Design an enzyme around this catalytic site. Structure first.
Site, PDB file in Angstrom:
ATOM      1  N   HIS A  46     -35.084  74.946  36.213  1.00 48.88           N
ATOM      2  CA  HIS A  46     -34.978  75.684  34.943  1.00 48.88           C
ATOM      3  C   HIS A  46     -34.924  74.788  33.703  1.00 48.88           C
ATOM      4  O   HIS A  46     -35.223  75.243  32.611  1.00 48.88           O
ATOM      5  CB  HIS A  46     -33.867  76.744  34.965  1.00 48.88           C
ATOM      6  CG  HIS A  46     -32.511  76.273  34.548  1.00 48.88           C
ATOM      7  ND1 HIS A  46     -31.470  76.224  35.448  1.00 48.88           N
ATOM      8  CD2 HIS A  46     -32.044  75.935  33.323  1.00 48.88           C
ATOM      9  CE1 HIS A  46     -30.414  75.848  34.754  1.00 48.88           C
ATOM     10  NE2 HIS A  46     -30.715  75.641  33.478  1.00 48.88           N
ATOM     11  N   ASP A  97     -33.519  76.780  42.192  1.00 49.32           N
ATOM     12  CA  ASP A  97     -33.264  76.008  40.978  1.00 49.32           C
ATOM     13  C   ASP A  97     -33.010  74.541  41.291  1.00 49.32           C
ATOM     14  O   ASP A  97     -31.885  74.036  41.261  1.00 49.32           O
ATOM     15  CB  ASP A  97     -32.164  76.663  40.131  1.00 49.32           C
ATOM     16  CG  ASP A  97     -32.263  76.318  38.665  1.00 49.32           C
ATOM     17  OD1 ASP A  97     -31.338  76.672  37.919  1.00 49.32           O
ATOM     18  OD2 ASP A  97     -33.271  75.676  38.265  1.00 49.32           O
ATOM     19  N   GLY A 196     -26.026  73.038  29.023  1.00 47.73           N
ATOM     20  CA  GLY A 196     -26.234  71.601  28.878  1.00 47.73           C
ATOM     21  C   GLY A 196     -25.769  70.854  30.107  1.00 47.73           C
ATOM     22  O   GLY A 196     -26.140  69.704  30.297  1.00 47.73           O
ATOM     23  N   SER A 198     -26.474  72.070  33.160  1.00 47.10           N
ATOM     24  CA  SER A 198     -27.453  72.409  34.194  1.00 47.10           C
ATOM     25  C   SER A 198     -28.128  71.197  34.759  1.00 47.10           C
ATOM     26  O   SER A 198     -28.271  70.213  34.052  1.00 47.10           O
ATOM     27  CB  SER A 198     -28.511  73.356  33.657  1.00 47.10           C
ATOM     28  OG  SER A 198     -27.938  74.553  33.164  1.00 47.10           O
TER      29      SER A 198
END
Ligand SMILES: N=C(N)c1ccc2cc(/C=C/c3cccc(CCO)c3)ccc2c1
Length: 246
Positions: A46, A97, A196, A198
């Site tokens: 992502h 992800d 932030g 992730s």
């Protein structure tokens, strides 16, 4: 990271700081990552799906501050940006992800392990920590959901793993959280990962071994009651990681 503590790269040496170069030459922080082998950083798809040009990214290892050239840090370009082919995003949930970034210094070299640059071991299949296990997160993500700036200094926190059945409760995420995802949160809802963070690591000490159990993926707000942070369960992706790093 909401709450938690400020830290330095020496305590999180597998931590990768990923930035993007924009037209005009400005550089902004994108996401976190984890060094799994000297040439390979693992993160979340992502973080890159909307800007999938490998040339745009800058990866730092051994970097403790968002805007400081930490002594011993190493700067890299992305030789290969591998996004998961089955990545998808629902209103909340992000599926598959996971992303792999093959790193290269301007001389064509991979990471040089040092005191501040180390890899993090991958989990083994069907062996994730039990619910209630304390795990740590690291990132340069928001300190508050209302902030638009990221902290200058790297932060870390400690969260506890939440079972799949508790995470599927109606007030939690219901059927939106799957068995390929791990929930982790603070029982008091005061500390969490946030925007932030992730792509960054969820590191669990399991059987005396420091393991990359998860990858910061998604959540409803940050440190919200009954809204755990959701992480990519790395143990499910061992065949995908192996095939894509060979
Ligand atoms: N509750 C959490 N642990 C959690 C985990 C991951 C999160 C991830 C985000 C991601 C936000 C986002 C993703 C892509 C692009 C953008 C806009 C560019 O700033 C924003 C927001 C909140 C989060 C909250």
């Amino acid at each position: 990271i909401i709450g938690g503590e400020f830290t330095t790269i020496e305590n999180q040496p597998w931590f990768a700081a990923i930035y993007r170069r924009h037209r005009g030459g400005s550089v902004t922080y994108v996401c976190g990552g984890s060094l799994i082998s000297p040439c390979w950083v693992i993160s979340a798809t992502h973080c890159f799906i909307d800007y999938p040009k490998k040339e745009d990214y800058i990866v730092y290892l051994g970097r403790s501050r968002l805007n400081s050239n930490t002594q011993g840090e190493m700067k890299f370009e992305v030789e290969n940006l591998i996004l998961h082919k089955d990545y998808s995003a629902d209103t909340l949930a992000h599926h598959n992800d996971i992303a792999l970034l093959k790193i290269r210094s301007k001389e064509g070299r991979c990471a040089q392990p040092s005191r501040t640059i180390q890899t993090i071991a991958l989990p083994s299949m069907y062996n994730d920590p039990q619910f209630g296990t304390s795990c740590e997160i690291t990132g340069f993500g928001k300190e508050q959901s209302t902030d638009y700036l990221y902290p200058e200094q790297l932060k870390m926190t400690v969260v506890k793993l939440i079972s799949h059945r508790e995470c599927q409760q109606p007030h939690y995420y219901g059927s939106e959280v799957t068995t390929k995802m791990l929930c982790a949160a603070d029982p008091q809802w005061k500390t969490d990962s946030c925007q932030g963070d992730s792509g960054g690591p969820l590191v669990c000490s399991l059987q005396g071994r420091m393991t990359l159990t998860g990858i910061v993926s998604w959540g409803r707000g940050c440190a919200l009651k009954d809204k755990p942070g959701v992480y990519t369960r790395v143990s499910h992706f061992l065949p995908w990681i192996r095939s894509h790093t060979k």
